[PDB]
C-alpha cells in the first residue's frame, strides 16, 4: 500500500539511550515550603507553585506592517495558590488570624526534595531547583463546610502575593 515505509530500529534505540542518559523525572509530590519563622506548618501544605518568571513586552510596528516584540522590565509581584489541610486544633485558623491581626511580611522558600538525593533522615536541597520569594503577604479564602462529605477533610485555600523573586 505505502511504498515509503522502511523500518530502522537502530535509530529508535539511539533515541531511547539519549533520552535515558539524563537522570530522572521529578515527581510532582516532592517539595517543601518553609514560611520563615513558622516552620511547624511546613508539614500541612498540600499544594504549591513556582512564580511566573516573565517580562513585559513592548510592541512596535515598523515600516509597512513589520512588527517587533522587545524585552521589558521584570515582573516582580504576582499570586500563588496554596492549599493546606486542617487539624482539630485549628493550626491554620490560628495562623491566619495572627497574620490578619498584625501586618507582617513573611519570606517563603520553595524547594524540591527528591528521595534519591537525601542522606540519613534529613532531606538535602540543590541550588538549581531552589527559588525564594520575599516580602510576601498571606491571605485566606472562603472555607466550605458541609454534611454528606464524610469521606473528605476540610482544606483551606491560601492566596500569597510575593514582591521579589531571588535565587
Amino acid at each position: 500500500g505505502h511504498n515509503n515505509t522502511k523500518g530502522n530500529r537502530k535509530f529508535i534505540k539511539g533515541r531511547y539511550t539519549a533520552n535515558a542518559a539524563k537522570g530522572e523525572r521529578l515527581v510532582s509530590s516532592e517539595f517543601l515550603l518553609t514560611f520563615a519563622g513558622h516552620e511547624d506548618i511546613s508539614v500541612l501544605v498540600r499544594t504549591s507553585q513556582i512564580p511566573e518568571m516573565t517580562r513585559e513586552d513592548v510592541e512596535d510596528y515598523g515600516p509597512n506592517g513589520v512588527k517587533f516584540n522587545q524585552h521589558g522590565p521584570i515582573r516582580n509581584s504576582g499570586e500563588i495558590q496554596v492549599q493546606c489541610v486542617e487539624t482539630i486544633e485549628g493550626d491554620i485558623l490560628q495562623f491566619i488570624k495572627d497574620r490578619i491581626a498584625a501586618k507582617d511580611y513573611v519570606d517563603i522558600t520553595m524547594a524540591a526534595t527528591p528521595e534519591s538525593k537525601s542522606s540519613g533522615v534529613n532531606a538535602v536541597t540543590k541550588a538549581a531547583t531552589t527559588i525564594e520569594m520575599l516580602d510576601c503577604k498571606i491571605y485566606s479564602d472562603a472555607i466550605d463546610f458541609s454534611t454528606e462529605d464524610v469521606t473528605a477533610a476540610v482544606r483551606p485555600s491560601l492566596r500569597i502575593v510575593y514582591n521579589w523573586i531571588e535565587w
Partner: protein
C-alpha cells in the same frame, strides 16, 4: 564540664526516662511480660517521635560519626545478663555571638 550545665540537656533525658518508665509499667501487664524484643519497638517509636519534634539532631561531623541521631543497641553476655542502651545527640543552644568588622 559535661554539656549538663545547660538547662535543656538534662530536661530531654528526664522526659525520655519518664516516658520509658510509663511504657515499662504498662508492658508488665502483657502476657509475656518484660522482654528485650518488646523493649526495642516502643523505644524506637518514642525516639522517632522525639527526633520528629526536633529535640535530637544529627552529629556535627558526618565523617567521624554516623548520620543517625540516636543509636539503640542490645548486647548479650552469657544468658542471664542482658543490656539495653540508647545514645542521643542533643540540640544545641545559641548563647555566644561575635562580630568582626573590617574596612576595605
Amino acid at each position: 564540664d559535661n554539656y549538663l550545665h545547660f538547662q535543656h540537656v538534662p530536661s530531654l533525658m528526664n522526659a525520655i526516662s519518664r516516658f520509658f518508665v510509663q511504657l515499662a509499667r504498662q508492658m508488665k501487664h502483657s502476657p509475656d511480660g518484660i522482654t528485650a524484643a518488646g523493649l526495642t519497638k516502643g523505644m524506637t517509636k518514642l525516639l522517632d517521635r522525639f527526633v520528629a519534634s526536633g529535640a535530637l539532631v544529627a552529629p556535627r561531623d558526618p565523617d567521624a560519626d554516623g548520620t543517625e541521631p540516636y543509636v539503640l543497641k542490645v548486647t548479650q553476655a552469657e544468658f542471664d545478663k542482658w543490656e539495653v542502651v540508647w545514645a542521643c545527640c542533643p540540640t544545641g543552644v545559641a548563647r555566644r555571638i561575635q562580630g568582626v568588622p573590617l574596612l576595605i
